Amino acid sequence: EKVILDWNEYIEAARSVVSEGCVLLENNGTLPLEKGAVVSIFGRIQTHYYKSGTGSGGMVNVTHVVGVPEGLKLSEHVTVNEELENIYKEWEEENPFDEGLGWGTEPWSQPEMELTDEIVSNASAKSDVAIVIIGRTAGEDKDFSDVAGAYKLSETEEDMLRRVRKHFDKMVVLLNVGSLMDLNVISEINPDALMVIWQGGMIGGLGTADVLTGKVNPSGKLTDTIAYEINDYPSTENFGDPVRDYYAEDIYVGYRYFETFEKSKVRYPFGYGISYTEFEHTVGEFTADINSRTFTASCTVKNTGSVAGKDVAQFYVSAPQGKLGKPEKVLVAFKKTGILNPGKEEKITVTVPFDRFASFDDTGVTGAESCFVLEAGEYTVYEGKNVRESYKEGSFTLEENIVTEKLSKALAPMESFKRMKASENSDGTLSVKYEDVPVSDVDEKKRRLDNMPVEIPQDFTARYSLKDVLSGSVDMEKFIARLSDDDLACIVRGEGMGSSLVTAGTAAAFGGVSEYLRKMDIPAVCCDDGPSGMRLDSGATAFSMPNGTMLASTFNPDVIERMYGFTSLEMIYNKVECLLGPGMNIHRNPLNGRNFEYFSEDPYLNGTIASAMLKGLHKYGSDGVAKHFCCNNQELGRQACDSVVSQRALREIYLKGFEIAVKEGGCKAFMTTYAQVNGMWTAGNYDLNTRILRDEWGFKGIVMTDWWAQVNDRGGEPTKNNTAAMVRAQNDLYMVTANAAMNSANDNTLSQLSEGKLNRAELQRCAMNICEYAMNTMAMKRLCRNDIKVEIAGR
Ligand SMILES: OC[C@H]1O[C@@H](O)[C@H](O)[C@@H](O)[C@H]1O
């Protein structure tokens, strides 16, 4: 069976995402740019558009990048001041773009060109409007930093902006950035318009020109809260320490903290974004259904301005403080309108199950320790344009607690620390107090022994194929019998990077990594980075898509899912079965370097966007790998850092997005972290990989390590070859080893199995996970000769 991947529709799908994810923050009418106008473009970064951040999720090779000057010219709606372009081009020949010396050594920004009264004054005389581009990038292993040239403007950048401001009376500022930066000094200089354009991949400039020229009306929204100062953020106090960080802010991350305790410290709230038109949000019908555990809220959005556009209806719940304490508001639903013509309107209706605003009782004060619960009291629903400007939509009251789900004491902290508590002063204001987090009392050895899987007796005369499991002819248990201990120790190894069993230049192969495993019709399954498109270290080119933060700012799961439906076909064309994405760690602090390839400070949005990306990839049978599970919110010291975090914060915030990816996204593959969560490495954590992921959420799939990650037993020394610890946790795949069949890493699987410290049943459990995954991949279909063939058209 054969299928066309139309490259022009793929470009157009990516172009729509860029055009729905730019976020307009301020505008006095200077945008959109007027038909026929001539624009002077400032900032040297205009010649080297940041299409992505740095590291594993930003090494997509491409033939050409459409930056902002080029996209504007191709609009045929404005012209660019070409003299000023030549000044930049000629200057850049003496001061070339610094690409850096290696891996995480490419700098945050480039040194800016100093401008003269002369150059700027002359540009003004020959153009109607200035556009100033400020550029920042970031990524793996370098955290962003509160210094000039990083979170702050450099002195020459600030100079550039002041000169431009003085000599032009129409001034637009674009931030070509992976993550948020300081807007204090920008807002003070006071440009006519300010827009965040993120990093849009290889067609960024096409979609950015669309919004700048009014062909598309900006409809993007912030996925984080922009505070006035870095010290205003609740996590800053406890972030950036390479050894250990205490998550004292607990569930009060981002807008959960600011809307609750510190409204005045917010410059732009979560969900904020404007348009070239204006919208009226009118509250509608509200009903609750306590027995179904849902409510239904309606509202109507009307376009009250002079140009067509989209807006986002955002719904929030205020839970009763009760005994646990709650944030003032939590996001539970959102819906972006179609394009609405002036004076037209759309009725928006959402149905919200109660589990979206439940709370996890980790202390037992509700009488339901280790449960998601709805405390007794009044639930108020709000609807609006953002979290601040959201208004009463409905309410209901519960006389008794409702227990939404019975879970267990899992992944609890091994030491005491103080966490934030919402305490209501007698005038009803909420203030920050601190309370002790209770220490874990789980006997981990017993838990592992009590839930030990049953061994399957080996049988080497049974020549059943994995094809026979797929057909239905035999049970998976019947097939797995055939695997020797050599085969079992081999199948839990990933081979890479650049294994010759799969497409050159990809991250790994797994499944059929020996001749003996391949004889069983276990196919070799190919993994490759990354969320923003295929990284091929062979140099082959692929589609470079917008960064994750820009994806999230669309607030539009359908536009994201359409794009990744094309990426689904591109993967099959390149014989890549598993894309290492989405990255979906929470934005705990603005200064985390990898924030660019993650989505939000909110877990509902974070999970909903991840799921959209996955539904895209699943369209033609490809797949994604959710990463990094969990609490990789910091790049500094990430090989050993210890995130010390409560169960409630874990269940409601850090794990919740991943939970949604499993239950709504259909996620079948997860990747663990390089670091520690509550006193041991994630790759060998039983509570994470078996208790929560499998027993509690019902995940049926594979877990894999991060690349060359360390693993340990609790209390023990970390090593890159303790695969027995990994298998005891049901982390199924060590990624990666140069040669798996020869045990190139000298792992301890077999030695620990002879000593009885690893049970055969545990290896067989991993092998059944690997095989059941592998048989539903496109690589299995190739063996069966029933796979999709892809041809590329429009080139
Ligand atoms: O190259 C593959 C891997 O690389 C690691 O360095 C990174 O933390 C992961 O995101 C993973 O994708």
**Mutual angle of helices 557-573 and 7-21, in 10-degree steps:** 150
DSSP 389-420: TEEEEEEEEESS-EEEEE----S--SS--EEE
Asked whether 177 lines ligand 1 (CB < 6 A), one says no
How many Å lie between the centroid of ligand 1 and the Cα of residue 61? Answer: 17
CA-closest candidate to residue 237, choices 255, 223, 222, 250: 250
Strands of 371-374's sheet, edge to edge?
A: 359-361, 371-374, 402-406
529 CB near ligand 1 (under 6 Å): yes
Measured in angstroms, the resolution is 2.3
CA-to-CA separations, 751 to 140, 722, 746, 758, in angstroms, rounded: 35, 11, 10, 9
Q: Domains along the chain?
A: 2-246 (3.40.50.1700), 444-793 (3.20.20.300)
Taking a C-beta distance cutoff of 8 angstroms, is the pair 551, 220 a contact?
no
Cα angle value 537/543/548 (rounded, 5°): 95
d(CA 692, CA 674): 19
Kindly state the tokens that stand for 488. 């079992």
Substitution candidate for ligand 1 out of 59, 535, 536, 580 with most atoms within 8 A of CB = 580
Q: How far apart are CA 416 and CA 434, in angstroms?
A: 12
Backbone phi, psi, residue 244, to 5°: -150, 140
Please tell me the distance between residue 717's alpha carbon and the centre of ligand 1 in angstroms: 23
Q: Are 553 and 23 in contact (CB under 8 A)?
A: yes
Query: CB–CB of 596/178 below 8 Å?
Result: yes
> Which two structure tokens, joined as six digits, stand for 162?
């002041």
Instruction: Report the Cα 542 to chain-centroid distance in Å.
Output: 21
Integer angstrom CA distances of residue 700 from 387, 475, 520, 667, 696? 36, 16, 22, 9, 11
Tokens 């509200």 map to which residue?
286
Give the CA count within 13 Å in the CB-facing half-sphere of 318. 16
**Hey, which of 56, 576, 628, 641 would you mutate to test ligand 1's pocket, going by the most ligand atoms within 8 Å of its Cβ?**
56
Residue 48 has a CB neighbour count (10 Å cut-off) of: 18
In the reported structure, the alpha carbon of residue 216 is separated from the centroid of ligand 1 by a whole-number distance in angstroms of: 35
Mutation pick for ligand 1 pocket among 527, 639, 670, 706 (CB with most ligand atoms within 8 Å): 706
Q: Ligand 1 pocket, 622 CB below 6 A?
A: no
The experimental technique used to determine this model is X-ray
Q: Which residue's CA is the closest to the ligand 1 atom numbered 10?
A: 56
Residue with token string 């004076």: 343
> What number does the ligand 1 atom closest to the CA of 674 have?
8
Q: Is any ligand 1 atom within 6 A of the Cβ of residue 580? A: yes
Q: Ligand 1 centroid to 58 CA: how many Å?
A: 11
Q: How far apart are CA 22 and CA 292, in angstroms?
A: 38
134 CA to centre of ligand 1 in angstroms: 28
- Closest ligand 1 atom number to CA of residue 632: 8
627 C-beta closer than 6 A to ligand 1: yes
Count of helix runs (H) and strand runs (E) in the chain = 23, 34
C-alpha span between 182 and 228 (Å, rounded): 8
Atom of ligand 1 nearest to the CA of 580: 12
DSSP 8-class letter at 584: -
Rounded to 10 degrees, what is the CA torsion of 137, 140, 145, 148?
-30
Residue type, 315: F
* Contact indicator for 160, 43 with CB cutoff of 8 Å: yes
CA distance 758 to 752: 5
Distances (CA, A) of 186 to 108, 134, 171, 183, 248: 18, 10, 12, 5, 32
Ligand 1 centre distance from Cα of residue 298 (Å): 43
- How many CB atoms are closer than 10 A to CB 113? 16
What lies within 8 Å, CB to CB, of 373 at 6+ separation is 358, 359, 360, 361, 366, 401, 402, 403, 404
Whether residue 487 contacts residue 517, with contact meaning beta carbons closer than 8 Å, is answered with yes
Q: How far apart are CA 694 and CA 117, in angstroms?
A: 65
398-409: buried (b, 16+ CB within 10 Å) or exposed (e) per residue?
Answer: beebeebeebbb
Question: Ligand 1: distance of its center to the CA of 673 in Å?
Answer: 9
Per the CB < 8 A criterion, the answer to whether 575 and 503 are in contact is yes
Q: Please, what's the largest Cα pairwise distance for the chain? A: 87
For ligand 1, say whether the CB of 745 is within 6 Å of any of its atoms. no
Question: Cβ contacts of residue 90 below 8 Å, gap of 6+?
Answer: none
How far is it, in rounded angstroms, from Cα 110 to Cα 463? 61
For residue 581, give the ligand 1 atom closest to its CA: 12
SS3 (DSSP) at 753? helix
Expressed in angstroms and rounded, the spacing between residue 765 Cα and the centre of ligand 1 is: 25
> Distance between CA 732 and CA 702 in Å, rounded?
6
Residue 543 CB contacts under 8 Å (≥ 6 apart), including other chains? 10, 14, 60, 62, 201, 202, 533, 534, 566, 567, 570
Neighbours of 325 (CB within 10 A): 24
Pocket test for ligand 1, best of 495, 528, 529 (most atoms within 8 A of CB): 529
Residue of minimum CA distance from atom 8 in ligand 1: 706
Q: Ligand 1: which atom is nearest the Cα of residue 530? A: 12
Q: Residue 707: CB within 6 Å of ligand 1?
A: yes
Q: Which residues are registered as beta bridge partners of 36?
A: none
- Gap between the Cα atoms of 625 and 533, Å rounded: 13
Q: How far apart are CA 608 and CA 559, in angstroms?
A: 13
Q: Is 537 tagged catalytic?
A: no
750 sits in which H/E element: helix 749-754
Dist CA 571 CA 227 (whole Å):
40
Cis upstream peptide for 582 (omega within 30°): yes
CB proximity list for 729: less than 8 A, separation 6 or greater: 683, 684, 685, 686, 688, 689, 690
Would you give the DSSP letter of residue 141?
A: S
Ligand 1 proximity of 532 Cβ (cutoff 6 Å):
no
Q: How many residues are present in the chain?
A: 795
* Ligand 1 midpoint to CA 171 (Å): 40
User: What is the identity of the amino acid at 476?
Assistant: M
Q: Say if ligand 1 is within 6 A of residue 629 CB.
A: no
Measured CA distances, 673 to 516, 596, 638, 643, 722 (Å): 31, 18, 8, 11, 15
| Residue tagged active-site, from 706, 713, 732, 787 | 706
**Is residue 795 classed exposed, middle or buried when 0-12, 13-18 and 19+ CB atoms within 10 A define those classes?**
exposed
DSSP-derived secondary structure letter, 436:
E
Asked if residue 597 has its Cβ within 6 Å of ligand 1, the reply is no
Give the atom of ligand 1 at the shortest distance from the alpha carbon of 627. 10
Looking at this protein, which amino acid is placed at residue 745?
A
Identify the H or E element spanning 605: helix 603-618
Per-residue three-class SS string for 280-292: EEEEEEEEEECCC
For the chain, what is the radius of gyration of the CA atoms? 27
> Which residues are CB-contacts of 247 (< 8 A; sequence separation ≥ 6)?
235, 238, 419, 588, 631, 643, 644, 645, 646, 649
Q: Residue 613: in which H helix or E strand, if any?
A: helix 603-618
Cβ-contact 544, 62 below 8 angstroms: yes
Supply the residue whose CA is at minimum distance from atom 5 of ligand 1: 707
Ligand 1 neighbourhood includes 56 CB (under 6 angstroms): yes
> With a 6 A CB cut-off, is 594 part of the ligand 1 pocket?
no
| DSSP label at residue 474 | S
Give the other-Cβ count within 10 Å of 29's Cβ: 9
Distance CA 99, CA 96 (A): 9
Q: Is the peptide bond before 530 cis (omega within 30 degrees of 0)?
A: yes
List C-alpha distances in Å: 721 to 510, 639, 710, 712: 17, 15, 8, 9
375 lines ligand 1 (CB under 6 A): no
Distance CA 355, CA 659 (A): 12
Distance 412 CA to ligand 1 centre (A): 27
User: E-assigned strands of 70-176?
Assistant: 79-80, 129-135, 171-176
- Nearest residue to 545 (alpha-carbon basis) of 25, 29, 52: 52
Q: Please indicate whether residue 507, judged by its CB atom, sits closer than 6 Å to ligand 1.
A: yes
How far lies 718's CA from each of 34, 157, 676, 704, in Å? 61, 45, 10, 17
Distance, in Å, from the CA atom of 755 to the CA atom of 500, rounded to the nearest integer, reads 34
Q: Do the Cβ atoms of 736 and 742 come closer than 8 Å?
A: no
CA dist., res. 772 & res. 563, Å (int):
28
Residue 631: CB atoms within 10 A of its CB come to 29
How far apart are the C-alpha atoms of 131 and 137, rounded to whole Å? 20
| Closest by CA position to 55, among listed 517, 438, 580 | 580
Residue 697, burial from CB neighbour count under 10 angstroms (0-12, 13-18, 19+): middle
Distance 56 CA to ligand 1 centre (A): 6
The residues near 347 (Cβ < 8 Å, ≥ 6 apart) are 284, 298, 299, 300
